[PDB]
Design an enzyme around this catalytic site. Sequence first.
Site, short mmCIF file in Angstrom:
data_model
loop_
_atom_site.label_atom_id
_atom_site.label_comp_id
_atom_site.label_asym_id
_atom_site.label_seq_id
_atom_site.Cartn_x
_atom_site.Cartn_y
_atom_site.Cartn_z
N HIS A 1 0.85 -1.22 0.00
CA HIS A 1 0.00 0.00 0.00
C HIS A 1 0.87 1.25 0.00
O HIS A 1 0.69 2.10 0.84
CB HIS A 1 -0.98 -0.02 1.17
CG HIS A 1 -2.19 -0.84 0.91
ND1 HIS A 1 -2.33 -2.12 1.39
CD2 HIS A 1 -3.30 -0.59 0.19
CE1 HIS A 1 -3.49 -2.61 1.01
NE2 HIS A 1 -4.10 -1.70 0.27
N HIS B 1 1.75 1.73 -5.67
CA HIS B 1 0.34 1.29 -5.78
C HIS B 1 -0.52 2.48 -6.18
O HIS B 1 -1.42 2.34 -7.03
CB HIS B 1 -0.16 0.68 -4.47
CG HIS B 1 -1.64 0.47 -4.45
ND1 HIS B 1 -2.25 -0.51 -5.19
CD2 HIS B 1 -2.63 1.09 -3.78
CE1 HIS B 1 -3.55 -0.48 -4.96
NE2 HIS B 1 -3.81 0.50 -4.12
N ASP C 1 -8.28 -0.27 -8.36
CA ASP C 1 -7.64 -0.69 -7.10
C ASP C 1 -7.23 -2.16 -7.19
O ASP C 1 -6.18 -2.48 -6.63
CB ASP C 1 -8.55 -0.42 -5.90
CG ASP C 1 -7.81 -0.37 -4.58
OD1 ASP C 1 -6.58 -0.23 -4.59
OD2 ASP C 1 -8.47 -0.46 -3.55
O1 JLR Z 1 -5.23 -11.25 -3.36
C1 JLR Z 1 -6.04 -10.80 -2.56
C2 JLR Z 1 -6.60 -11.64 -1.56
C3 JLR Z 1 -7.51 -11.08 -0.70
N1 JLR Z 1 -7.87 -9.77 -0.77
C4 JLR Z 1 -8.82 -9.18 0.13
C5 JLR Z 1 -9.99 -9.88 0.49
C6 JLR Z 1 -10.94 -9.31 1.34
C7 JLR Z 1 -10.74 -8.03 1.87
C8 JLR Z 1 -9.58 -7.30 1.53
O2 JLR Z 1 -9.39 -6.04 2.04
C9 JLR Z 1 -8.82 -5.86 3.36
F1 JLR Z 1 -7.54 -6.44 3.43
F2 JLR Z 1 -8.78 -4.49 3.65
F3 JLR Z 1 -9.51 -6.52 4.37
C10 JLR Z 1 -8.64 -7.88 0.66
N2 JLR Z 1 -7.36 -9.00 -1.66
C11 JLR Z 1 -6.47 -9.38 -2.56
C12 JLR Z 1 -6.03 -8.35 -3.53
C13 JLR Z 1 -5.76 -8.56 -4.87
C14 JLR Z 1 -5.42 -7.33 -5.42
N3 JLR Z 1 -5.49 -6.40 -4.50
N4 JLR Z 1 -5.89 -6.99 -3.30
C15 JLR Z 1 -6.01 -6.28 -2.10
C16 JLR Z 1 -5.02 -6.44 -1.12
C17 JLR Z 1 -5.07 -5.74 0.10
C18 JLR Z 1 -6.08 -4.87 0.37
C19 JLR Z 1 -7.09 -4.67 -0.61
C20 JLR Z 1 -8.14 -3.77 -0.37
C21 JLR Z 1 -9.09 -3.61 -1.31
C22 JLR Z 1 -9.06 -4.31 -2.53
C23 JLR Z 1 -8.05 -5.18 -2.80
C24 JLR Z 1 -7.05 -5.38 -1.85
MG MG Z 2 -7.48 1.13 0.37
ZN ZN Z 3 -5.61 0.70 -2.99
#
Ligand code: JLR
Ligand code: MG
Ligand code: ZN
EC number: 3.1.4.17
Length: 313
Positions: free
Chosen positions: A68, A72, A217
């Site tokens: 992050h 990014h 994103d």
């Molecule tokens: O590979 C992944 C496996 C799981 N999640 C995930 C699942 C459920 C809530 C989640 O958000 C949270 F961590 F805030 F809880 C993330 N995301 C990715 C991923 C792939 C590409 N980007 N990305 C992201 C990685 C890290 C924060 C992301 C935030 C928003 C969108 C994509 C985010």
């Molecule tokens: Mg964010």
């Molecule tokens: Zn982001």
Amino acid sequence: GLMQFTLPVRLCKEIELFHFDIGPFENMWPGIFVYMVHRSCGTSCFELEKLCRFIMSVKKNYRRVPYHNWKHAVTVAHCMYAILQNNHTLFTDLERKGLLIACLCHDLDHRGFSNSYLQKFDHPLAALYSTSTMEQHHFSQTVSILQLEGHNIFSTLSSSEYEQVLEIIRKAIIATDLALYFGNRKQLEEMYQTGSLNLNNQSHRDRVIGLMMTACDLCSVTKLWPVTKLTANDIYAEFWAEGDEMKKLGIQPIPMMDRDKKDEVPQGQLGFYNAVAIPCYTTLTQILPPTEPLLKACRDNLSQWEKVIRGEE
Ligand SMILES: O=c1ccn(-c2cccc(OC(F)(F)F)c2)nc1-c1ccnn1-c1cccc2ccccc12
Ligand SMILES: [Mg+2]
Ligand SMILES: [Zn+2]
């Protein structure tokens, strides 16, 4: 006014594609962003001097976290640039100005922790904002930097336009709260299939912009496999750090964030492409046909992860 930012040939060409990687040279990312604003919005829309001061303060306010980070921020803004260039006439002069800034700022001052961790730690930001905790922070930071001296890149806008653009940016940034994504796509799918979707309904534009934001994103999942593969390392390095901090509070973290369960990642990526990414780019391609390359590339990578599970890499 006559200072057209130009890129080397391979960048000048590869940058127009959705799967562009901005590369390892930090010192080039600001030039890349400006070039995108100039092509996407005009040499006119911003004052080069104020823009550069704004970019550099925004860079300064992203932290040294594995995923992050500043890279990014600029990657997400690049995807948004690709969408706007492939949908040249669908969007206003203001939306184009505001949406590239929204993306550059969407993760300002991220520490590599989910809203959940903030709530369970009882972080002061969780008292101030109950829902979309980091996202209201990111917007609040965007407003802070806009209000520094020589940083108002919107100065030439009326009072009206100034409030419209900051309201585009706020909804844009809020919409990166993935918890909000699921219901937002459900509603866009239903409006599209029952044929009621209408890009003059401001309420409908707002939804569509939110889905573009989820799409930008997530755009690491739409790169060529070697980029996607290596970004997953950065993503999980933050997940495992958060799990460590969950365990420190006396809470077994979900396995996604448990580093003792590294082995379960490839099946976790499957889940996320099936539950989140594929649905996101499907509905976005239905609304904006020219964004198809993101769907294709996402499918290509879903397929690459299945190969990982079947021991073919
Ligand atoms: O590979 C992944 C496996 C799981 N999640 C995930 C699942 C459920 C809530 C989640 O958000 C949270 F961590 F805030 F809880 C993330 N995301 C990715 C991923 C792939 C590409 N980007 N990305 C992201 C990685 C890290 C924060 C992301 C935030 C928003 C969108 C994509 C985010
Ligand atoms: Mg964010
Ligand atoms: Zn982001």
